[PDB]
Each structure stands twice: as structure tokens, then as C-alpha cells.
Amino acid sequence: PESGEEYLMHMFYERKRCPAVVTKRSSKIRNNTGNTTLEMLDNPELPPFKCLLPTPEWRDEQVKSFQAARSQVLVLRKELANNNYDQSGEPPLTSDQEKWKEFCRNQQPLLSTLLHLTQNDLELLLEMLSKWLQDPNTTVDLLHDVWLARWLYATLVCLHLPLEPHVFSTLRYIARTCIHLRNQLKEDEVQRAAPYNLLLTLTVQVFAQNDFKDYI
């Protein structure tokens, strides 16, 4: 009893007769699944000596100092945009990493330098810095290797927001490695553990990756 459109009206009415939600369990085979689990990133060292860790009053204080410099960079960036600074007018930067390592070691993260870098540059510089901790055959210290720490800070302030997700990832690696570095500290002085504590504070506090809370 259909013509063209008529079968559609035969169907809307056919599905109306139907229970819409049907549930049917066991019957054949079933049983509890053995499964394939999940390949997971291992949680760091919990750590030894919770005394090396910082005071909340300090953490909150160090975050003020960060957010303040961040807001002051924004001020300087707006003043640059008003003076029609075209970021695209910036020539091509090296990808050498070694040419870079020497630059950061020897030149400082002054705003004059840092403001000339695009979000993509900062993005890449951070990946570089990350790899510069993630076992250089160098016995890295941050307290000693100040230029690293100084740059890591700068780079972190500058990063334009929202941050891309792989920037969060390549930041969590920095979190992890200074968690690591710091765990190697005795009591090897509170001040020697100080940089890592800041770069963790930030990660948990500023970049709100709380699945670290308990390492800061």
C-alpha cells in the first residue's frame, strides 16, 4: 500500500510499534574479559625529603612575581602593536639547537631579544630547553646552569595564551626532569633544590597540571 512518499509513512509507523530500547545479556559464551590493559606514562618519585619542598606562602608569592612579569610583557607587547610592529617582518631563525645552546649560555633572556620571537619560536625554544635537561651527558644543575633556568623562566612568561596541548606536554617533561633532578638532592641544600621547586610550582599553579600537586 505504498506509492513514493507512502513507504516513509509505513516506516515511521513501523518503528512506532517497536520497543526502541532492547537489552539482551549472557546467552552465548560471555564470561569476564582478560583484556589488554593500558600503556601508561609512569608516575615520578614521590620524593625523598619533603623538607626540600616549598612553603605554600612561598609558592603563592612566586606565582605573583610570575603573573606580574607576564602582565608586564603584555603591556610591552600592546605598546609594540600600537607602534605597528609586524611579527612577520622578523627574519628566519636558526633550528640548529647547538647554535641556540651557545646563544642562551652566552646571551641573556632580555625583553629586547625575547619579544622578537613568535609563539612558534618560544614553542620550539622550550622543546630545546626541555631536551637540554632530559640527559645532556652534562651533569645539569639549574642552580649552577643558571642560563638554562633563566631562559626556561623567560620562555615560560612569554608563551602566548591559550597554550597549545603539546606545549603542555613538552612542559610536563620539564616538570618530570626537575622532579627527577631534585630527588637526587640530599638535603643537598634547600637553595640548590630551589629552581626545580619554582618550575614545579609554576607547572601545578600557573599551567594547572595538578596531577603534580604532590611533588610541590
Binding site: 603591556v75 605598546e79 625583553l111 633563566r150 623567560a154 612568561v157 629552581p195
Partner: peptide, 17 residues
């Protein structure tokens, strides 16, 4: 405000010592 090109080196240094 405006100047002090050091700033990022200064705020990091003071945030640690």
C-alpha cells in the same frame, strides 16, 4: 613599568634567592 630590559632575569633571580 615600560623599560628595564633585565626584568625577566631579575624576577627569575629574586624568585630563587
Amino acid at each position: 613599568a615600560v623599560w628595564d630590559d633585565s626584568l625577566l632575569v631579575k624576577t627569575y633571580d629574586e624568585s630563587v634567592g
